[model samples]
Target: ASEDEFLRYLWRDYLYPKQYAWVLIAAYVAVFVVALVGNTLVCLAVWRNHHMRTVTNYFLVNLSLADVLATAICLPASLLVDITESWLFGHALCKVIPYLQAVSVSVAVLTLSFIALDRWYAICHPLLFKSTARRALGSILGIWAVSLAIMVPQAAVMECSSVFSVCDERWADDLAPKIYHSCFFIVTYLAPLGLMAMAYFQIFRKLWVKQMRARRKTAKMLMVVVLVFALCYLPISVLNVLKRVFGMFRQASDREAVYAAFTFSHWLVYANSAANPIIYNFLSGKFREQFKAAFSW
Candidate 1:
């Protein structure tokens, strides 16, 4: 009991470092603005230009929408909290904002996987390409729906208290917090990671064995999609799980070390919105060209 108290005390103090706070706040604001504008532009360009309306582009639009939401909803609020060390916006944002953030990320991951499979099918069975648009949109919508459903429990049970200063998930009993956190990690982080791995592995295998030109194109697209997903998500997910596990076992003095690790990881996760713009704009010629054409006016 004494040890637990010591650990909690250390954790409370170490979570916020005065020197690093301002720098992080500035960086978060910059990233948030860039991601929001860029993603919005992408979505607009895709919607307005008929020539850009390919089946895959439709998925890209959905991806852009998710990024826009992540930037607009999660990033700025998080920056504000990190900067002030206070939840100044009050109770509602604490629940809705975080829930939306979770849904956006889940939708982004699931949509990316669906895009990979779309490319695979385009290569493996060109005849099926025409049929993909409706299914793809439906699948993307289903992903959003599923994400919303899975995250409902989180928003429903959690509430903000004036005394606590932030919203917390309600655990029905003493061990509820841990169980809730664990379930959240599994559903949002672990499950999506596993799905991405399986989807990409099968995609690469099919392409390599065939050695066809169409298969090669599909392979390249899958690789880029997987790279973007992993690059944006894996570091944060791995570190979050690490932090949780460490918190369960480590001593008070080690709290700062864990928090320091999470600080880096949190930055990466927040940057997901910002990074997508670079990936789509610079890495994807199709998106780049269309963006330029649309914005040139």
Candidate 2:
């Protein structure tokens, strides 16, 4: 079965049921509107304001741009699909859209990890960093290259249905769909999570042990980033593992359970796109100020 079955279940329960249409509508609109405006202002604030344009801010610019793209391109269409239970847009989008979404998301995660390492060096080994480290621009280019390389395989293997109701990674008949799902879980979610955990842990150890002056700001920002990443994504990762196991069993009830887990996970994924701007505004004072000034309320 297509992922659409899972998504449709989520819409029936959380989004469209119990007359939550108004609440869901308001939330979805607010998320899209605020994320776009906040991230755009983040871009403009860093680009236009000379004081805000640092190497760190350049990475934030990339992060905000990724968030903007995710918000604008993915979340709205996802909501529409959840509401309609069909992909009315056509089969072409079924192929192109998921790839674009994956590209943006993977880049966002990679950028965040890179920024954490940059901060670790800047705070813990400032002198060494200044002498041996490459410029952040080159680092940003490398990050994009890495993100693209990681995502291309998944995109190349994606299956788009003529039925217009689903999009997901394709597998040859020899390998079961469950095996494909399990492999994707490891390559995409588990691997990145492990990398992020290692980087952040090293960064944290340095902050606590070596850097007294930089502790407050660095710790706060890093904690916010880490928490945001974990809370938003951990559920999906857990459910993805469960999905593989569930698929192994041939029981129809297990199918429904797996669908439920997938539905919740999918909804949470979209929610993560919406929640990121709030985290940005909270952790970065500059973002908060810019958001307030740009909106003028």
Candidate 3:
């Protein structure tokens, strides 16, 4: 009992989460394991089958790769930060984790954008753009390069406060973070969504013509992917924009309301990471068949 008492005092700062916290911890675990397993299976299915190599599948693989990156690299730090309200991953990771998250978001939106454009042209304007799996490979590389480049500032500003033990971004000037966030909203959400709207509209209409159901099946899976992202990210994105623009949560009561609300908002983002492969299995017979075959025993 004395040894137990001593250890407890020594590890006082440690969050041995219990009761309600268990729920949050379990949710994070579910997101991480489900997302990691599902995305890995998607990649595995593609890798094991040469016949699965196609332009759209290539982009889908890239999309899965982004989720893999997020679930593996980004999710831990985030779960830690949310629970502890401090960045326990240390200083270097303070920069690295969030930056990679930024990169993953970029990779996802850019890949989705390309998928939309590819589907649009391939179906809607069959003669407009020629696409190949090799070209899709080229585009995947281009996505990483571009994602890494554009999100550099996310790493640059991220800092760990030795004094406070917090991880956050602090730009060169005050307005810079806001400006960058607004631009990020445009790049990650608005612009891509705009392109998605127009592209999917044209493609889905053209879809019900001939090869109908099979094409719609594939298209529906991809469409649901984008739709889930759009829906899940909406609350947090709006909260972020309002937290900046309206500045309404400064009041003490409002602060706690916002704080509590963040649980749902952030979980939605993590839920988005876990949602895609499930969508694929539900909507795409090919993916369902592979998953069943892969684990039928």
Say which candidate scores most in TM-score: 3
List, in order, the clash count of every candidate structure.
0, 0, 0
Give the lowest summed-lDDT range of ten residues in model 2. Answer: 242-251
Residue by residue across 1-297, what tens digits does model 3's lDDT show? 599887786565354435447877799899999998888888877887777777888898898899889889888777776676777888998899889888988999999999998888878878877899988999999999999999998899888987659888776765776787788888888889988988998887787555677678788888888899999888877787766545557578665456657776777787887898889788877778788877884
- In model 1, which runs have C-alpha deviations exceeding 4 angstroms? 1-19, 124-130, 174-180, 208-222, 242-246, 249-259
Cα lDDT, all candidates:
0.69, 0.67, 0.82
Error of 1 at 7 (Å): 30
Off by over 4 Å in 2: 1-24, 131-134, 162-165, 174-183, 208-215, 244-261
lDDT of 1 by residue, 255-295 (tens): 55555555566566767667766666776666688778767
After superposition, candidate 3 runs with Cα above 4 Å error: 1-19
Q: Lowest-scoring 10 consecutive residues by lDDT in candidate 1?
A: 240-249
Report the lDDT of model 3 for residue 217: 77
The CA lDDT at 180 in model 2 is: 63
> How well does each candidate superpose onto the true structure, as a TM-score?
0.78, 0.77, 0.89
Q: Rank the candidates by lDDT, best first.
A: 3, 1, 2
